Amino acid sequence: MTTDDLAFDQRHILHPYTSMTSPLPVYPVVSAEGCELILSDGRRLVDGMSSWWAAIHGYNHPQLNAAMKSQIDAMSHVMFGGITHAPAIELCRKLVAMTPQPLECVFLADSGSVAVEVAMKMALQYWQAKGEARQRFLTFRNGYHGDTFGAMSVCDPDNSMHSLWKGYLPENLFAPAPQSRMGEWDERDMVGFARLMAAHRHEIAAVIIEPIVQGAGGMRMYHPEWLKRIRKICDREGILLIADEIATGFGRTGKLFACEHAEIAPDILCLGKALTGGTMTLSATLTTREVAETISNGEAGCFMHGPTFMGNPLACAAANASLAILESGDWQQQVADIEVQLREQLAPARDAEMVADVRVLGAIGVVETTHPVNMAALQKFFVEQGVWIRPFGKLIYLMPPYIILPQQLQRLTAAVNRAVQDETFFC
Amino acid sequence: MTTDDLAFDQRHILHPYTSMTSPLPVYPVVSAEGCELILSDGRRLVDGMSSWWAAIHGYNHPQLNAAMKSQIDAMSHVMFGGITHAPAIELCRKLVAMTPQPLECVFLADSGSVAVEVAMKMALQYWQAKGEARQRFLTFRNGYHGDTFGAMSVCDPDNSMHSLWKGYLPENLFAPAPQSRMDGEWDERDMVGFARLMAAHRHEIAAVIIEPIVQGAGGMRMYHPEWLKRIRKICDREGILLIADEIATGFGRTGKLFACEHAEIAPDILCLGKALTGGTMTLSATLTTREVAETISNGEAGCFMHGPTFMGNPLACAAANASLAILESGDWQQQVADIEVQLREQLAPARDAEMVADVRVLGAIGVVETTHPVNMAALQKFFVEQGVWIRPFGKLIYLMPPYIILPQQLQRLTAAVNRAVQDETFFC
Ligand SMILES: Cc1ncc(COP(=O)(O)O)c(CNC2C=CC(CC[C@H](N)C(=O)O)C=C2)c1O
Ligand SMILES: Cc1ncc(COP(=O)(O)O)c(CNC2C=CC(CC[C@H](N)C(=O)O)C=C2)c1O
Ligand code: NA
Ligand code: NA
């Protein structure tokens, strides 16, 4: 990649949530292997982010590559209307088997935001079919579910800046962010949620939350009793529960799915990211036959959704390989060992002036700071330490591949500890 | 593939816009090559659908395959936040160069619906940043732009059953479907409805959004290019942004590289997908002008607020680059022109069948519209029995084949269509 290439990127290529006028530095990556990203000039970086949490098996994984190349040899893609294929069937068999028993119907889609849109549409169509006037969603503050208009409508109105779309987005119900930590349970915490449930129980189509961990909305880790109470409340009121596990699914929090921490099953489950081992985009939204059949028996005769590339053979094959790796079960001790090391190596950050909080769960390690990070300056510092860490807001956090070596994880935590010693990289 | 596999699929796997309680049969596909799909039982079918518009180079294309395998060797994926890579840069260079001069800023995304959502958010943020009170979209009836919630808000309310979401979906403005045909003459009267809505709401409209020339899902309609010339001029006069959704028409399908070329106009925002990757896997792109891209970033947000996990996916970009490289040979132009002539010639006799309401053709799109709806299970079986994959929808029996299709293969497709409509058997 020439300098002109980089110039073109800066002036012509929009990057995720960043200015086209005040771009901060980008780093040119040529390849990746194991837990390392390789830059154009040869610099090798230990990946602390798993490419936004998806690459749980690292990069250039033999199993993943083999499955992908083999599916390309058969067919990378064929349409899913009136046709089915082995990769979709094998993938759906695994998804049904690995999730709670009631979740036995699968709607594959292209991305996390779309999987959330699908779950939302499922709930609305469900009630439309039952002839129940229910169109509200009840969610938590600090929640984040994606970037498309439906998903945006259930994101924290303050973090996702709902003022920008005030008038276009439907108005949903936002209970207080869960206060009890993953910590002791305080009954005082339920008051806000209960309040909204009592006043709006007749019109709520579904409750939607990220289980245990609220990711992009603040890397918050809350008490599982919340999920227990919400499942019970939904059960009593006849409301659907949507669990967004696009970030928490496939082992990240120490359990296969975060709902397991509370031993609850949602009515609708959204999955993505690590689904494909972070090789390419794919999502899945699972629900019950009660939901799936009711919808088909309604006025529309079917669930009204179906994107062009639905069921893409290549992506399904990658996902099959990713799930196959998890089948060994090795992730359980890998994540447990990571958790221990994170909790050990991040503890010193609690002596640093710039730190507000340190919290760890499975392969998620968070250092919350008192002031906003300088994302450009901190990223450069990290690159200089030979690590890839992408902080944002007041969070310097790690979500590494499950296969990361102790010495690699150590470089990440050391860099973090060093970074927070200095106002240098803040405001 | 076993029959148990088919049972699992029927009972546990949702398919696009189809019932779970009253299933229709699906056909198991094990592989595909050239312009053929290969069923699990060994039957080979000539593909008449291009897997919904996208597989313009067919299947198991050596150039696409090699490009995908090579990218896997480097990295199938890496995040795009604070990172860039060669496949993304090359693709964006190509996209900027092949589209109208003003369109030079590229937002890569995952799917067509997301690309439309991005276009719509761009329009909203553009006006929110100039301090103007514009949150409505003006679109045409019989339009389809995706099935995520924002996209649904600009789809035809009847065709997409907006009654199901009545009260949840924002109410946009719907001008009548364009009446003048690509085949025929322009009629000034066509404009009254659109002109009327514009005059009454010119002040609240953030953008006009349409599919140029061909409205796909909403009826496979083919309208007169004068429509786009007018819409461009009107948008220009009123200071309104024009969004062209070319997710279906892009990359040669209508006989021109982009359907906007039939009118020689450029939109402010252009959405692409489908054939972008040669139908190998999902990827989309929304391009806009410097004026739009810079204005948004200077707004309160400080940036365009969107960024999906797999944005810029190296693997998909590599496939898209290979697909575009194939189109650089220019061979598609004659290929599509020849397909067009053959479709016109061989579907023409369908116009004398009693079951046929209309026959219309543009580039590598051939449509036989019928008077009654098709019997899906029955007609699908007939087609497969003829050794062809044609998937009709409602009153439309259509062909959109890969550009590489051989005349003999194309002839089997048209023969089958003509045979399907000769009597009332496969209808209702
Ligand atoms: C829990 C959850 N649900 C849905 C989605 C949307 O999935 P997509 O595939 O459509 O993106 C996500 C997406 N996860 C994200 C993770 C990180 C960021 C950005 C963090 C920070 N602001 C930064 O700039 O780096 C955004 C989305 C999800 O987690
Ligand atoms: C013009 C246009 N714009 C947007 C989209 C959305 O792209 P996705 O990748 O998100 O799907 C598309 C393509 N989407 C569809 C087009 C038509 C249908 C209906 C098919 C019909 N039911 C049938 O069986 O034949 C569905 C999605 C597009 O063309
Ligand atoms: Na299950
Ligand atoms: Na251009």
Side-chain angles (χ1 to χ4, degrees), chain A, chain B residues 1-184 186-428:
Chain A
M1 274 173 284
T2 74
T3 56
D4 188 60
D5 282 343
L6 279 288
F8 182 84
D9 168 87
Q10 181 170 89
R11 277 222 107 225
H12 300 285
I13 301 182
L14 268 86
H15 282 256
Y17 293 90
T18 190
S19 174
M20 277 296 275
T21 51
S22 300
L24 313 159
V26 309
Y27 298 84
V29 172
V30 295
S31 70
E33 45 185 81
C35 289
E36 295 178 277
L37 309 180
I38 305 188
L39 301 192
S40 275
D41 67 3
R43 280 177 284 168
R44 308 178 61 94
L45 309 180
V46 170
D47 182 26
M49 314 308 298
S50 290
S51 281
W52 272 330
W53 325 342
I56 55 162
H57 314 292
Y59 302 87
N60 244 301
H61 195 280
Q63 268 177 103
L64 303 183
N65 290 353
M68 296 181 61
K69 291 192 179 176
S70 291
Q71 186 57 42
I72 282 165
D73 286 341
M75 53 184 183
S76 77
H77 183 66
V78 68
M79 61 180 289
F80 216 47
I83 278 165
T84 189
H85 54 254
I89 292 172
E90 177 180 344
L91 172 59
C92 288
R93 282 192 189 280
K94 291 173 157 67
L95 292 170
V96 169
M98 73 195 298
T99 54
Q101 213 50 303
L103 297 163
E104 65 175 288
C105 296
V106 184
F107 192 100
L108 299 173
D110 326 309
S111 73
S113 293
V114 169
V116 167
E117 302 263 339
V118 159
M120 295 180 77
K121 283 175 76 171
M122 278 178 175
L124 294 175
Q125 252 197 104
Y126 177 78
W127 295 114
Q128 195 285 329
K130 285 178 81 70
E132 245 152 314
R134 288 176 182 268
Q135 292 178 143
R136 314 293 295 270
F137 293 89
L138 174 52
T139 186
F140 279 152
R141 285 203 183 265
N142 284 270
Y144 176 85
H145 297 293
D147 286 353
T148 48
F149 287 111
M152 282 182 46
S153 80
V154 289
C155 288
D156 200 72
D158 302 311
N159 289 318
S160 280
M161 294 176 70
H162 281 184
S163 52
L164 294 178
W165 335 98
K166 212 212 283 332
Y168 208 82
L169 290 186
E171 182 181 357
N172 284 314
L173 305 162
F174 298 84
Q179 274 288 66
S180 304
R181 287 164 65 107
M182 172 64 179
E184 294 174 358
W185 169 261
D186 185 350
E187 202 73 357
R188 234 165 40 203
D189 209 0
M190 281 266 9
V191 183
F193 186 94
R195 185 157 29 239
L196 288 166
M197 180 57 67
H200 301 278
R201 72 217 279 243
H202 66 296
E203 63 177 346
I204 294 171
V207 166
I208 178 167
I209 59 185
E210 291 163 274
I212 307 304
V213 180
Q214 298 186 287
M219 287 293 153
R220 312 183 73 260
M221 300 162 178
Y222 65 84
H223 202 293
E225 184 64 18
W226 263 108
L227 296 181
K228 288 179 168 158
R229 282 281 215 309
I230 287 172
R231 178 69 274 177
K232 274 47 258 194
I233 291 159
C234 285
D235 279 357
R236 152 172 14 105
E237 306 290 352
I239 294 168
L240 295 171
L241 177 61
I242 301 165
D244 182 348
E245 294 227 29
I246 287 153
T248 54
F250 305 110
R252 183 60 69 187
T253 74
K255 278 182 195 282
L256 191 58
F257 299 107
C259 281
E260 291 185 16
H261 288 288
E263 319 190 295
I264 88 162
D267 295 279
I268 300 162
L269 172 68
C270 302
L271 300 174
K273 291 184 185 290
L275 174 61
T276 63
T279 54
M280 67 193 291
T281 194
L282 184 70
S283 69
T285 299
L286 284 79
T287 191
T288 59
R289 342 204 37 96
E290 161 71 4
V291 168
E293 293 191 349
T294 292
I295 292 165
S296 273
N297 288 337
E299 300 172 7
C302 72
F303 174 55
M304 292 282 287
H305 209 100
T308 298
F309 286 94
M310 181 171 191
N312 178 60
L314 178 55
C316 288
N320 278 327
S322 174
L323 287 185
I325 296 163
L326 293 175
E327 278 174 2
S328 71
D330 295 350
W331 67 265
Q332 297 168 256
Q333 195 74 286
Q334 280 173 158
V335 172
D337 282 359
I338 286 164
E339 187 178 59
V340 174
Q341 185 165 165
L342 282 170
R343 350 227 340 167
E344 266 176 30
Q345 295 182 3
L346 292 178
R350 297 191 167 96
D351 303 335
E353 11 141 324
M354 298 311 291
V355 172
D357 189 47
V358 176
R359 51 190 182 264
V360 178
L361 184 64
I364 306 167
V366 183
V367 170
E368 191 181 322
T369 60
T370 49
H371 303 63
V373 298
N374 182 321
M375 191 199 288
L378 200 37
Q379 284 229 93
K380 179 165 208 320
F381 168 75
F382 286 142
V383 167
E384 293 184 346
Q385 306 304 294
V387 300
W388 180 250
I389 301 170
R390 200 220 181 31
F392 75 90
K394 294 173 187 179
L395 306 168
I396 297 176
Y397 73 99
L398 304 165
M399 285 175 78
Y402 300 167
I403 61 152
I404 193 162
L405 297 166
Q407 62 186 92
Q408 291 175 312
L409 219 201
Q410 233 184 91
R411 278 165 65 203
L412 294 172
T413 46
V416 172
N417 274 298
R418 200 163 150 211
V420 302
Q421 281 331 294
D422 81 74
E423 292 175 359
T424 317
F425 306 125
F426 295 85
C427 291
Chain B
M1 199 111 47
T2 70
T3 69
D4 171 70
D5 287 337
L6 302 185
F8 181 84
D9 171 88
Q10 184 164 84
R11 192 109 182 118
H12 298 273
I13 300 187
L14 276 70
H15 283 253
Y17 296 91
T18 193
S19 167
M20 276 300 278
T21 47
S22 266
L24 291 194
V26 296
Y27 298 83
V29 173
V30 294
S31 64
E33 45 174 26
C35 287
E36 305 181 277
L37 300 186
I38 306 170
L39 299 187
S40 294
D41 60 29
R43 284 178 301 177
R44 311 174 69 86
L45 310 172
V46 174
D47 180 32
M49 307 308 301
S50 294
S51 283
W52 277 322
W53 298 88
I56 59 174
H57 313 299
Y59 304 87
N60 244 305
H61 193 291
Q63 282 172 253
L64 301 176
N65 283 6
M68 293 182 310
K69 289 188 189 200
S70 286
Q71 191 53 46
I72 290 171
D73 287 345
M75 49 183 197
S76 180
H77 184 66
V78 71
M79 64 184 285
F80 215 43
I83 283 175
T84 186
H85 47 82
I89 287 165
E90 180 184 357
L91 175 56
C92 290
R93 278 195 188 274
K94 281 188 176 74
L95 286 176
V96 168
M98 72 197 300
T99 51
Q101 203 272 309
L103 297 166
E104 69 171 282
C105 299
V106 190
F107 188 98
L108 295 173
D110 317 312
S111 73
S113 293
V114 172
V116 163
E117 300 266 332
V118 161
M120 292 179 76
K121 288 176 68 168
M122 283 180 172
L124 293 173
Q125 264 195 89
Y126 177 79
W127 293 117
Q128 194 277 349
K130 301 198 94 87
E132 274 178 52
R134 299 177 182 267
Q135 281 188 139
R136 298 196 87 178
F137 292 86
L138 170 56
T139 184
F140 47 28
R141 286 184 185 275
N142 285 300
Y144 178 76
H145 294 110
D147 41 18
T148 43
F149 275 102
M152 290 169 73
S153 80
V154 288
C155 293
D156 185 87
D158 302 302
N159 296 340
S160 328
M161 293 179 96
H162 280 189
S163 62
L164 292 167
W165 334 104
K166 194 169 284 146
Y168 200 78
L169 277 182
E171 271 137 294
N172 284 302
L173 302 165
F174 297 88
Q179 291 159 27
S180 300
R181 288 171 68 111
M182 184 70 220
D183 271 331
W186 170 252
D187 181 352
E188 214 62 38
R189 228 188 133 226
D190 216 350
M191 284 289 326
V192 330
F194 183 94
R196 217 180 347 187
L197 288 167
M198 178 61 69
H201 305 274
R202 50 172 38 101
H203 73 256
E204 13 162 49
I205 297 163
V208 170
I209 183 171
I210 69 187
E211 294 166 86
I213 307 313
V214 183
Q215 303 185 287
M220 297 296 302
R221 314 176 78 262
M222 305 168 176
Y223 64 85
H224 201 288
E226 190 63 27
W227 260 109
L228 299 176
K229 291 185 185 175
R230 296 287 198 262
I231 292 171
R232 179 67 278 174
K233 280 166 146 34
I234 293 175
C235 283
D236 278 353
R237 253 131 52 189
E238 309 286 349
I240 291 164
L241 297 175
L242 175 61
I243 296 162
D245 177 355
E246 289 221 37
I247 283 156
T249 54
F251 304 109
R253 182 61 71 181
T254 68
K256 298 211 182 283
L257 192 59
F258 299 102
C260 279
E261 293 184 15
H262 281 109
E264 296 180 284
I265 60 101
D268 294 281
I269 300 163
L270 178 67
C271 298
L272 303 169
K274 291 191 171 165
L276 177 61
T277 62
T280 52
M281 55 187 95
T282 192
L283 184 67
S284 68
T286 305
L287 289 81
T288 195
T289 60
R290 194 128 230 119
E291 166 61 19
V292 168
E294 292 191 10
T295 296
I296 291 169
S297 290
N298 289 334
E300 279 183 31
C303 71
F304 173 56
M305 295 264 291
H306 205 104
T309 297
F310 288 92
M311 181 165 190
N313 180 57
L315 180 54
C317 286
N321 279 325
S323 173
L324 294 176
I326 292 166
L327 296 178
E328 288 177 349
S329 75
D331 290 353
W332 68 266
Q333 289 198 256
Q334 188 63 245
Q335 277 173 158
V336 168
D338 288 345
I339 281 160
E340 182 175 58
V341 170
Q342 188 172 157
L343 284 169
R344 303 207 146 119
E345 264 167 73
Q346 303 188 159
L347 291 178
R351 287 190 180 102
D352 293 330
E354 192 151 342
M355 286 312 293
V356 176
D358 192 53
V359 179
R360 51 188 182 269
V361 174
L362 183 57
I365 309 172
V367 187
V368 178
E369 178 179 340
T370 59
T371 57
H372 302 346
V374 305
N375 178 336
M376 282 294 276
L379 185 51
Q380 194 60 86
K381 176 174 147 68
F382 169 81
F383 281 146
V384 168
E385 275 167 18
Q386 296 304 291
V388 300
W389 182 250
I390 297 171
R391 176 127 187 297
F393 155 58
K395 288 160 180 175
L396 305 170
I397 289 165
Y398 65 98
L399 305 171
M400 40 183 49
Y403 301 169
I404 60 155
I405 191 157
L406 301 163
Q408 187 269 344
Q409 283 175 325
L410 179 50
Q411 199 166 139
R412 280 181 73 187
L413 288 175
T414 61
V417 170
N418 275 292
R419 198 165 167 163
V421 303
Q422 49 177 53
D423 70 29
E424 42 281 322
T425 309
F426 303 129
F427 292 95
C428 279

